[PDB]
Every structure is written in structure tokens, then in C-alpha cells.
Amino acid sequence: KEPCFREENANFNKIFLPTIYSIIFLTGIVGNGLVILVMGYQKKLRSMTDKYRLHLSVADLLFVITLPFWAVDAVANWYFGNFLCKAVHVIYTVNLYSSVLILAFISLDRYLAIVHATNSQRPRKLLAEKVVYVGVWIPALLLTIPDFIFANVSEADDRYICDRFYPNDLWVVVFQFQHIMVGLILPGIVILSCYCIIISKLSHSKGHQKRKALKTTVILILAFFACWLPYYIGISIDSFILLEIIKQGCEFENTVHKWISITEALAFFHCCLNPILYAFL
Amino acid sequence: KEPCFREENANFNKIFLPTIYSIIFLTGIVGNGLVILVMGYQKKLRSMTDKYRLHLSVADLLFVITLPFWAVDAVANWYFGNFLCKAVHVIYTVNLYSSVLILAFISLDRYLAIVHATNSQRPRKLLAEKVVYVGVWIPALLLTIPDFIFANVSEADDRYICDRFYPNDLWVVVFQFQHIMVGLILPGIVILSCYCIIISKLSHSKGHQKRKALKTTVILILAFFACWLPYYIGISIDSFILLEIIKQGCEFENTVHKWISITEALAFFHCCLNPILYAFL
Amino acid sequence: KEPCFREENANFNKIFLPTIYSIIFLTGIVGNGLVILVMGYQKKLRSMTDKYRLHLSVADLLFVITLPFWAVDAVANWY
Amino acid sequence: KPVSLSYRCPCRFFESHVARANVKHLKILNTPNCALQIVARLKNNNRQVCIDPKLKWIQEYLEKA
Amino acid sequence: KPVSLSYRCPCRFFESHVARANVKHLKILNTPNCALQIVARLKNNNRQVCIDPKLKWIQEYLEKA
């Protein structure tokens, strides 16, 4: 049982990660600044969907502010102390949960608009103004209490790596399963169920033009989940590598680690496609 | 600063050692049995020297009784426990010191016989009757008290070896230097002093026929010291390997250990050359 | 034209050399001391050969009194 | 970061069945932000295997110093 | 037998100068009825060098368990 021997000097990751990080950072700051300037300050929003997209762009701006810290931690190692490490980690976590909670809220708003198109207009206004904050931002912040506590910087062999440190592997397994569940399963089930209800209730219409606005929402949700799917598959396979199931692979475990790093670099392209869907229609 | 490079080998040593032990044990027990039966039981001694040679043959028989235990230690693993290990060690140490004290007493007796040939006959008989025991057995038994204490059986890799075990290396260095001192330097200096005085006083005589007693004596002493010289040289080289003087040699230290074992096996030919000289003249 | 390939070894040599030096030094010291004490100090020479052998033993004693320096040079560092 | 990948220690397969006679060189790995990793090279197979920190043989070997 | 052919220590290079930053995974050899031979590999020179069993850094690394 060779334990890990986790030293493989993966040089292509250290040159590929900051390029993707800088590209996503530049397009994120440009697009999210444009969206917040147009639809948040000049009050150019028309429909009820654009308020949730404004919240998504706010969380997108928050994540792409701290993306160059991740680029610096990718090619160099961390020099900014523990407070910046805690802030970057907590900002990444609230953005990651908040984006999928926004998308679940847009899917529920589309379910309320398509099915109950006669008597559901004042619940939609309440859902867009008041209860939305305790819907997305309050459960995203309460899911970052272990992110507030256990994120620190170690005393390394002059790298000083910034990462969340757990007392034992049981906490790592539990929080990886919780992250997989809250990030993929329940919002995915809610979105799939309400969209199945939308599709089942749309066949009774005589080819109406009310589904023209439905295309942008399903394109955004499908692109988000297609961006986040291989990272979730890789971390589920790594979590099953933990608790002694596929234990016979060690170089396989290192390949899973490289796959997680590459797919997590590619999973930040969900920041790209929120203002691109406003660049097109 | 490399600690040891522990390496065993001893493929030729583990079979060459008990062969030499077997021939030396066989001819030693045969010769010492004949010497004890002829000159010790029948009281057939004519000259004065033969009583010291009787004491040397008694110590020789004591050592060659326990020599097959060393043969079993060489080819096989030690199975005799700790009491037999202690007995073998005390017999070996008392024989090794006792024989060189016999040779010192023989040189002193020859110095008394050659130089003071007129007035020294009563101190010769007293020296060889009563003072011989307190000269060659009492000081020999006080030099094996640490051999009584520190000899036991430890636990190697299922080996059950028999050796002297010390709390630290300073005790090993001190006892090796003490063994070198008592075994070589002072009795060799005494033997050289009496032989130089004998040779200087022999020139005044007109080529007297007393050299027949001297011839076997100097042959026995020179053969004993020629057998024990390379072992003492190897022990001195190992003792200077300790206390970090020639500390660059690690494989050289292994070669020193191999040569120490080889000329420790070859130094046991001092046993059989006492009755071999009785077989010749 | 490789320059030296200077490689040390001398594992057996560094212990075999002081051994042979020690036996030769000891028997040379003993023999030359007895020869000088018998034929040089007491003048117990008979033939004319022994004076030349006395000179040879004097040079021999001169060499073997410095032989242990060669032994120490062979085993360890020069001091 | 809900996932964690950079600090991942070699604390894998902490076996509790290790022979003290077969344990040849218990190499205590010195790493920070990690547990007492003690990888011991076996004698029968000559392969490194993890040992738990609560093992009686490892505790006796540590207390022998 | 005041020679001690077998049962030899690696109890030699008791160097006080030990660098805890350059120290790699230390190997505590399992030698019964001897001193605790802690042969600690050095990451700076990639060579195994002995460490004495009285260093403060080695004591802290052993006690960090």
C-alpha cells in the first residue's frame, strides 16, 4: 500500500491554469461591469427575469474580482496571508452556491409564469423583490461557516499553500458529499421537474409565441450545467476514491486530481456565458 | 555522515571459520590430552619449563573444550542460551590472558636461570610453585569481570547471538584499548627486556650449551606472537576507526571486520603449537 | 586520450600495508638491536665480513625506526 | 473551496494489522498540516505500508527512544 | 570476547547540526537492545545522514504525534 507519493511536477497545469484564469477574468470583468452598468444603474431592466440575472452578475463580479488571486496561486504560490485566503475562499463558495440558487429561482419563476399565467403576478413580484434575498443569499452565506472557520494557510516548505484544512478525512468526505448534493442534486431535480411541468403544459397551446423568451433561459441553464458536470463527476469519483472503494488506483488517483484541476479550470466558464447571452439574444 | 551500510555477506567466512575451528580443536584437544596425560598425570617432567607448559596446556584444553561452541556459532545460529554463552566468554578471556602471562613468567624464569645461575634457585622454585597461581590466574580472573557482567544473548533478526553488550561505544573503546595494552604491550616489553638481557649476557660465555633450552622457548614465544600480531594490528585499526580518526572508511571498516574475523580464526593456531613443539625438539 | 581515471580503492591495501610494516618493523628492531648490541658494542666480531654487516644493520635500524611513520602514513592522515 | 486538493496528505490505508518483527524501518514522515504519518517498510514483501498512530508496536518503538 | 564481531551499531554520526527545514522523512531503524538510531534523510543533499537522539528538532518531530 504505497500511500500517495503526491509529487508529479505537472508543468502543463501551471502554464495552462493562469491563461484560462486571465481570459475568464478579463471577459468576466468586462461583461459583468457592462451588465451592472446597464441593467443595474441605468434601470434598463424590462422583464422579471433580468433581476435574477442582475444578482447572478453581481455574484459573477464578486468571483472574478478574486480570480487573479487564484491565477497568482496557480503559477506562483500564496503571499497574501490568511485574511485574503479566507476572503477569497468564502467569496468563491458564496458565488458557487449563489449561482445555482439563482438558476433554481429563475426556473421556478418560469414555472410560475408559464403555468399560472392568470393569477400569479403578485407572487412573482414578491418572489423577485422580497423573499429572493433569504432564498439565495442567506442560505449561501450560512453554507460558508466551515469555509469561514477551516480556511487558513499552512507553514510549508516555502510555498505557504492557501487551502481549507480539516481535522480528519471524515470531515472532507462529509463536506464533499454535501457540496455535491447541494450543488447538483436538489437544484437539478427542482429545475428538471419544473421544466418537465413547463413542457407538459406547453403542448396544449396552439404554438404560441410566449416560448420565445424560454429559449434564453434553457440555453443559460443547459450551458451552466454542461460547464459544471465534469467537475462534479470528477469530485464524485474522488470522493468514492476516499472511504476505500477504488483504493487500488494511486496513479489513477493522481489522474483524477489532474482531471479535477483541469475541469475546475474549465468550470469557471459559467462566468463567461452570463453576459454573452446578453450579447446575443 | 552515513551511519553504517550494514551488509552481511560472509559466504566464504561462514564455512571457512568452522573448518579451521575443527582442525584447531581436534589437534589442540589431542595434543593437550597427551601433554596432560604424560607430563601432568605421570609427573614425568624433568626440566623446570614444563610446569609452565603444563599450565598453558590446561588453559589450552579449557579453551578447546568450548571451541566447537564457536564453530556452531559460526556455521549455525546460537541455541545454547545465556549461561553457556557466559561460560564460553569467560573461558576464552581467561585463556587469552592466561597464556600470555605464562609466556611472561617463562621469560622471567629464563632470565633468572641464565643471568643469576648461582644464587637464584630457591626463588625460581617458589616463583614456579606458589607465586605462579597468583601471577597468572588471579590477575586473569579480574580482567573478565566485565566479561562476567556484560555478556548475554540479545535479539537480532531471529538470530539469538552471543556477544558482549555495552551501554555505549566509550566502554567498547576503553576495553579494546585495555585488551590491546594487557595482551601485547607490557608482556611483550617484559619478554623483550629479559631476552635482551639474556642475549647481552650470553656473549660473555664461550658459546655454552644452554641454548637448547632457549631455542624451543624463543621458537614458542616467536610463534605465539606471530600468530597474535595481525589480529592485534586489526584490533588497533578498528579502535582507531572508532573515535572518528579514519572515519571516511565505511566499506574499509567492513573489510577491517572481515580481516579481523579471518585473522581471529588464524590466531587460534597458538593453541596447537605448544604440543607440536613437544612432538619435535 | 582519457587523462587519468584516478580511482582510489585500496580497501585491502590500507590494512595490509600497516600489518606488513608492523611485523617488519618489529623483527627489524629486534634483530638489529641484538646485532648492534652483540657485534658492535661488545666487539665480538671475528671475520672481516661482520663489520660490513654491522654497517648494514646500522642503516637497517635507521630505516626501521622510521618505518612506523610509513605505517601511520599508510593507514591514516599524516600528522 | 468546498473541495480540497492541494494539501492532500499520504494518510491512505491506515492498517491496524502490522507485525513488529516484519517492521524493518518505520519511517516517520515529517510533513506539516497533517497527522502522524508513519510509513513502515515491511520485511517479507519489502513494500512500504501505512501504520496507524494508535498501534501498540509503533507506540513501543516510539517509547523506546 | 572483547572484540564484538557482530551486533554493530549505526551509532556513529551523532551530529548536533540538524536542519528541520532540510530534513526529509526520518527513518527510525528497528534495532533491538540498542540506541534509537534515527537516520534522517536530508532533502538538501539527497543523502542519508545520522542524527543524534538529543536534538530539539528531532525531539519535537518525534513528539508531534
| Annotated binding-site members of E for heparin | 20-30, 41, 48, 64
In chain C, the residue whose alpha carbon lies closest to the alpha carbon of B247 is: C76
For residue A204, with 0-12 CB atoms within 10 Å meaning exposed, 13-18 middle and 19 or more buried, which class applies?
exposed
* Partner residues linked to E40 by β-bridges: E26, E49
What's the grid cell of residue A123?
A: 407572487
Closest among A230, A150, A161 to D6, alpha carbons compared: A161
> Does B243 contact chain C (CB < 8 Å)?
no
For residue A175, CA distances in Å to A86, A119, A143, A166, B76 come to: 17, 41, 10, 10, 60
**A182 Cβ contact list (under 8 Å, min separation 6):** A97, A143
Provide Rg for chain B, Cα atoms.
21
Sequence-ordered alpha helix ranges (H) in E1-65: 56-63
**E41 Cβ contact list (under 8 Å, min separation 6):** E23, E24, E25, E26, E27, E47, E48, E49
Measure the CA–CA gap between B139 and B105, rounded to whole angstroms. 13
Point out the residue among A96, A163, A238 whose CB comes nearest to the CB of D7: A163
Q: Which helix (H) or strand (E) holds A52?
A: helix A49-75
Question: Distance, in angstroms, between B242 CA and closest chain E CA?
Answer: 9
The number of helices, as runs of H, and strands, as runs of E, in chain B is 12, 2
Q: Is there a contact between C33 and B271 (Cβ–Cβ < 8 Å)?
A: no
In whole angstroms, what separates CA A248 from the centre of its chain? Answer: 32
Task: Collect all residues of chain A within an 8 Å Cβ-Cβ radius of residue D1.
Answer: 89, 92-93, 147, 151, 163-164
Please indicate the experimental technique that yielded this structure. Answer: cryo-EM
Measure the CA–CA gap between B97 and B90, rounded to whole angstroms. 11
Point out the residue among D27, D53, D64 whose CB comes nearest to the CB of E26: D27
Judge: A1–D50 Cβ closer than 8 Å, yes or no: yes
Q: Is there a contact between B221 and B100 (Cβ–Cβ < 8 Å)?
A: no
**Is residue D7 classed as helix, strand or coil in its secondary structure?**
coil
**D23 Cβ contact list (under 8 Å, min separation 6):** D40, D41, D42, D43, D51, D57, D61, E30
Sign of CA dihedral B77, B80, B85, B88: negative
Q: D44 labelled as ligand-binding?
A: no
Task: Collect all residues of chain C within an 8 Å Cβ-Cβ radius of residue B233.
Answer: 15, 18-19, 22
Judge: D1–A156 Cβ closer than 8 Å, yes or no: no
Resolution in A: 3.4
Q: Is there a contact between A232 and A185 (Cβ–Cβ < 8 Å)?
A: no
Backbone angles phi, psi at B11, to 5 degrees: -70, -45
Judge: A176–D11 Cβ closer than 8 Å, yes or no: no
In chain C, the residue whose alpha carbon lies closest to the alpha carbon of B246 is: C76
In chain D, the residue whose alpha carbon lies closest to the alpha carbon of E53 is: D65
* Size of the D and E interface in Cβ pairs below 8 Å: 45
What's the grid cell of residue A240?
A: 468514492
Q: Is there a contact between A234 and A263 (Cβ–Cβ < 8 Å)?
A: yes
Q: Is there a contact between B54 and B97 (Cβ–Cβ < 8 Å)?
A: no
> Does D6 contact chain A (CB < 8 Å)?
yes
Q: Is there a contact between B42 and B99 (Cβ–Cβ < 8 Å)?
A: no
Q: Is there a contact between D42 and D24 (Cβ–Cβ < 8 Å)?
A: yes
**Residues in chain B, overall count:** 281
Q: D12 labelled as ligand-binding?
A: no
**Is residue A67 classed as helix, strand or coil in its secondary structure?**
helix
Measure the CA–CA gap between B266 and B268, rounded to whole angstroms. 5
In chain D, the residue whose alpha carbon lies closest to the alpha carbon of E40 is: D27
Backbone angles phi, psi at A74, to 5 degrees: -75, -55
> Does C59 contact chain B (CB < 8 Å)?
no
> Does C13 contact chain B (CB < 8 Å)?
no
What end-to-end distance do the CA atoms of chain A give, in Å?
A: 55
Judge: D10–A179 Cβ closer than 8 Å, yes or no: no
For residue C50, CA distances in Å to A71, C35, C55 come to: 97, 10, 9
Point out the residue among C11, C14, C37 whose CB comes nearest to the CB of B199: C37
